[PDB]
Amino acid sequence: MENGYTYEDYKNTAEWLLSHTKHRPQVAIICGSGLGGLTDKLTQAQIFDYSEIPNFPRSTVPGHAGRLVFGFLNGRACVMMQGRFHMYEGYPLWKVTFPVRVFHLLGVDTLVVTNAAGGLNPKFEVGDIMLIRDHINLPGFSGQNPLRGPNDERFGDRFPAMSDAYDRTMRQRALSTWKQMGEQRELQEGTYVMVAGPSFETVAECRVLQKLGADAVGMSTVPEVIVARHCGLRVFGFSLITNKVIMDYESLEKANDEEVLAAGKQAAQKLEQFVSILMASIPLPD
Amino acid sequence: MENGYTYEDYKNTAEWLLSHTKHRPQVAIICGSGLGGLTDKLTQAQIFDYSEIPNFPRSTVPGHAGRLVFGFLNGRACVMMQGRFHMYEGYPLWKVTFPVRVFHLLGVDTLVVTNAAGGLNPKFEVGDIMLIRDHINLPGFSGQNPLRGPNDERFGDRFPAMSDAYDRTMRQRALSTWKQMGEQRELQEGTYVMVAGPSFETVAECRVLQKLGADAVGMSTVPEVIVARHCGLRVFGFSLITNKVIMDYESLEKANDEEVLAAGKQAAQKLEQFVSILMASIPLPD
Amino acid sequence: MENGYTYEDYKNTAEWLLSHTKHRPQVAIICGSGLGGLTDKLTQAQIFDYSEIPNFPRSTVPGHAGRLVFGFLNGRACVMMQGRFHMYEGYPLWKVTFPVRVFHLLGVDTLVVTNAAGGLNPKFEVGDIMLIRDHINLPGFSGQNPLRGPNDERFGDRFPAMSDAYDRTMRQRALSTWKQMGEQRELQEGTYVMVAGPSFETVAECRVLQKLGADAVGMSTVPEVIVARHCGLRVFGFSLITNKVIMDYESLEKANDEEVLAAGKQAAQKLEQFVSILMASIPLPD
Numbered sequence: 001m002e003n004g005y006t007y008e009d010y011k012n013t014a015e016w017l018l019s020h021t022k023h024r025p026q027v028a029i030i031c032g033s034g035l036g037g038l039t040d041k042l043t044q045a046q047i048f049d050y051s052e053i054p055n056f057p058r059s060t061v062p063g064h065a066g067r068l069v070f071g072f073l074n075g076r077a078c079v080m081m082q083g084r085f086h087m088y089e090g091y092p093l094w095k096v097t098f099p100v101r102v103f104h105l106l107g108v109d110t111l112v113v114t115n116a117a118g119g120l121n122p123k124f125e126v127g128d129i130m131l132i133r134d135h136i137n138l139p140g141f142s143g144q145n146p147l148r149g150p151n152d153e154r155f156g157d158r159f160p161a162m163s164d165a166y167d168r169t170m171r172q173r174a175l176s177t178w179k180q181m182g183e184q185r186e187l188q189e190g191t192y193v194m195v196a197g198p199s200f201e202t203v204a205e206c207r208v209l210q211k212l213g214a215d216a217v218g219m220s221t222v223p224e225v226i227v228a229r230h231c232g233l234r235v236f237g238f239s240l241i242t243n244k245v246i247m248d249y250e251s252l253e254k255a256n257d258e259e260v261l262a263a264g265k266q267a268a269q270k271l272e273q274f275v276s277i278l279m280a281s282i283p284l285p286d
Numbered sequence: 287m288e289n290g291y292t293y294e295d296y297k298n299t300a301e302w303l304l305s306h307t308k309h310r311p312q313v314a315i316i317c318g319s320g321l322g323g324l325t326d327k328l329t330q331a332q333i334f335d336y337s338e339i340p341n342f343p344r345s346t347v348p349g350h351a352g353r354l355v356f357g358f359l360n361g362r363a364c365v366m367m368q369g370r371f372h373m374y375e376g377y378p379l380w381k382v383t384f385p386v387r388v389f390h391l392l393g394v395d396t397l398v399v400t401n402a403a404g405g406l407n408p409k410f411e412v413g414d415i416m417l418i419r420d421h422i423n424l425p426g427f428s429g430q431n432p433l434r435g436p437n438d439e440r441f442g443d444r445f446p447a448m449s450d451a452y453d454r455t456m457r458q459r460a461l462s463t464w465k466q467m468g469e470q471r472e473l474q475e476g477t478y479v480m481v482a483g484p485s486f487e488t489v490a491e492c493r494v495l496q497k498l499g500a501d502a503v504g505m506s507t508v509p510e511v512i513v514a515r516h517c518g519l520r521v522f523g524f525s526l527i528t529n530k531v532i533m534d535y536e537s538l539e540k541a542n543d544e545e546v547l548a549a550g551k552q553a554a555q556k557l558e559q560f561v562s563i564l565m566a567s568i569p570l571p572d
Numbered sequence: 573m574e575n576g577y578t579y580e581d582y583k584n585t586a587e588w589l590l591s592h593t594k595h596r597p598q599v600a601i602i603c604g605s606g607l608g609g610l611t612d613k614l615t616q617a618q619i620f621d622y623s624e625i626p627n628f629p630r631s632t633v634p635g636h637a638g639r640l641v642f643g644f645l646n647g648r649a650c651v652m653m654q655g656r657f658h659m660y661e662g663y664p665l666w667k668v669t670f671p672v673r674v675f676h677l678l679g680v681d682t683l684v685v686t687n688a689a690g691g692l693n694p695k696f697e698v699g700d701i702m703l704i705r706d707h708i709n710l711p712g713f714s715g716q717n718p719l720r721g722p723n724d725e726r727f728g729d730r731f732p733a734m735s736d737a738y739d740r741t742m743r744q745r746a747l748s749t750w751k752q753m754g755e756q757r758e759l760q761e762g763t764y765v766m767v768a769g770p771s772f773e774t775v776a777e778c779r780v781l782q783k784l785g786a787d788a789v790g791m792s793t794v795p796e797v798i799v800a801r802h803c804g805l806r807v808f809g810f811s812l813i814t815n816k817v818i819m820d821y822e823s824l825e826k827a828n829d830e831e832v833l834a835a836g837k838q839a840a841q842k843l844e845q846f847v848s849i850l851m852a853s854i855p856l857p858d
């Protein structure tokens with residue numbers, strides 16, 4: 001196997017961009033669920049469709065979406081992906097994570113990723129948001145790691161570490177940032193596990209994941225994080241718990257995608273603003 | 287990655303069939319181990335080789351077999367696969383599970399799958415049959431899920447649920463159906479875990495699988511079930527425990543395929559008739 | 573999927589070799605870490621680069637290395653791979669394990685493999701060497717098993733067993749061989765788990781692996797062992813624990829590849845000689 005992209009394809013995509021917009025972003029954001037809004041919270045908004053951008057993964061089947069939106073979020077220069085790629089759609093991971101490498105070349109130095117995810121910790125509840133303190137990359141154990149293949153020294157090392165992937169500073173700020181707006185639910189913290197999907201977990205599987213010590217489960221994110229870290233970026237992210245994963249044979253409920261888009265609307269602005277004020281914590285460039 | 291088959295390839299395979307046999311099956315059965323017999327228990331039997339059928343995965347290396355057999359089993363219209371495809375043979379999962387999609391288009395609305403499997407629960411013994419109440423789809427965690435790729439809305443949703451994959455009704459009937467023939471061994475019930483093979487588990491691996499809460503382990507089935515569910519079918523199945531998986535370093539025994547084909551002959555008719563009377567439980571069409 | 577090599581490609585590579593060197597090895601050794609030295613400990617040393625050898629996986633990117641070195645180690649006819657292939661580099665497993673099949677055709681009947689690996693057992697310490705008593709083949713669970721595809725009856729069975737992969741005799745000799753040179757650290761024994769890499773584990777992942785009962789973790793070896801066993805070879809191996817895998821969020825240390833090459837030099841000769849005297853235990857040919 002081999003990454004389809006050549007070092008220089010990344011550079012070409014970046015420069016293109018570096019010259020079709022005045023913006024120079026510092027924070028990349030990958031939503032999410034609605035986030036929805038954040039496109040409005042932005043200001044100075046300049047949109048591109050993925051389809052216009054050299055090399056950008058070709059999202060394949062319409063529906064899709066596919067806008068890079070650059071602008072300013074709470075006094076930070078931002079670029080946000082509305083719609084992402086997933087392994088379950090058929091993309092090899094070096095396509096799923098291509099944007100991340102573009103972002104680093106645009107000058108970006110922090111990455112914020114968010115997602116919807118099923119709650120595995122029985123303590124959680126629908127609507128909680130969970131801060132990501134660590135992950136379990138199950139696909140990665142078997143081979144599906146977006147770094148598989150020859151390493152490009154210009155991006156990072158052959159064997160990078162992930163033990164510190166979720167910036168401790170940013171996690172503190174966020175827990176602080178959240179109490180100083182006081183809320184009826186606390187900010188949650190824990191381990192995200194990625195599985196590949198696209199079908200949802202059985203009860204026994206859900207039990208496996210709890211045993212492994214996962215608190216939440218979803219189908220993305222982890223690869224983008226690994227590539228972000230390989231690159232140098234500072235990374236921080238979290239999960240809107242959109243559903244309690246099932247957990248015993250009694251219950252007559254199942255997990256669906258109605259509930260995920262629905263819930264994504266309950267917290268539509270809860271997060272819209274969370275992320276937005278979070279911006280003020282993220283350091284600045286020298 | 288991409289499914290090699292186009293929506294219309296399925297339709298073409300079905301129609302072909304829908305016109306080379308008078309039968310219209312309602313129950314698909316995928317054996318199994320011998321089952322062997324069931325070809326005889328059938329009546330009105332019309333055979334096809336896979337090799338004659340448009341698009342049917344090309345089983346590759348002779349030995350193989352490869353007969354679709356249509357007919358009547360205990361007053362149900364049935365179609366049965368004698369010999370199946372496996373991931374360990376090299377087939378992508380969208381080939382392994384192609385027949386299942388054909389069956390749905392033939393009008394079939396229930397699927398019965400069976401297999402041989404190693405016992406992980408120490409309580410089980412060689413010869414038991416285990417009813418499948420749930421699965422752990424380890425390949426699926428990493429990417430090897432037969433639904434990976436663009437979803438075809440005409441078959442099912444993008445994110446289907448598997449928490450209820452093994453029809454509770456059918457499981458009751460079967461446990462009942464079995465006591466009303468009274469036996470010296472009970473019907474067993476539990477979790478099937480799929481691993482990809484083709485080599486057999488080490489002791490440490492066997493220990494991993496017990497810890498995860500699996501009761502039996504084999505190399506198939508799960509994908510066909512996921513595709514069956516994605517499609518609407520009612521699904522029910524089980525495992526002939528052909529061997530006790532090893533479990534500690536003391537023992538001087540290993541797992542082989544002699545014992546699997548051998549044992550498959552001990553229960554040759556035990557199941558031959560089990561499945562056969564089971565037919566009478568499965569509802570009917572309106 | 574399909575193995576790229578044809579039965580006869582193996583034969584062609586072997587014969588070539590069987591006629592460009594006088595040596596006829598009995599023991600294949602796959603290092604390792606430095607082992608470094610063993611090239612010197614050899615005598616009668618005849619080197620080939622992989623690049624000169626028909627069919628030998630093309631190591632792709634220079635740096636690489638790539639010497640088969642034949643000769644005599646402590647009165648055994650040996651062939652040793654300096655540098656190996658890994659799944660994380662992009663090679664399909666049927667390339668990673670190609671040499672092993674060549675070795676069997678050269679007449680070789682034992683295989684010794686060694687590697688660097690992170691310690692998961694808290695009892696271990698940097699510098700220990702761990703004897704491999706068993707493995708957990710996580711990639712194998714999902715599909716990445718070097719035997720996937722049509723089986724070639726001339727090498728081995730379709731469904732071979734791995735429960736006895738690590739020769740009990742050889743393990744005894746080694747534990748004995750080691751006490752009769754008395755040391756301040758004991759020889760360690762346990763389970764090696766393979767993960768695919770190339771990035772290092774998170775804390776949560778490390779915790780998963782302990783729970784599964786792994787004592788050490790690395791990114792290779794297991795596939796070569798499975799192919800060795802499929803073939804008939806006697807197999808024995810171990811791990812230089814080059815680093816203690818991290819294990820809790822407190823610690824401010826990470827895993828790197830400095831430490832792995834460094835430590836590989838601490839034990840440079842500790843193992844250089846261990847393997848070397850080990851030679852005297854391995855039986856002989858009739």
Ligand SMILES: O=c1[nH]cnc2c([C@@H]3N[C@H](CO)[C@@H](O)[C@H]3O)c[nH]c12
Nearest residue numbers: 116117118217218219220257260445
């Ligand atoms: O319970 C779950 N299991 C796995 N994934 C998801 C998700 C995320 N939501 C999306 C579809 O429900 C999908 O893209 C997935 O990443 C929400 N809940 C769950």
Ligand SMILES: O=c1[nH]cnc2c([C@@H]3N[C@H](CO)[C@@H](O)[C@H]3O)c[nH]c12
Nearest residue numbers: 402403404503504505506543546731
């Ligand atoms: O102990 C086991 N582990 C994994 N698979 C099997 C099987 C099933 N039997 C077949 C070969 O033994 C194979 O197709 C597999 O699906 C029986 N026992 C075991």
Ligand SMILES: O=c1[nH]cnc2c([C@@H]3N[C@H](CO)[C@@H](O)[C@H]3O)c[nH]c12
Nearest residue numbers: 159688689690789790791792829832
């Ligand atoms: O803690 C670890 N996790 C996974 N692999 C390794 C290794 C082995 N060392 C090499 C790179 O560090 C790599 O080829 C891997 O197989 C040493 N330590 C660890």
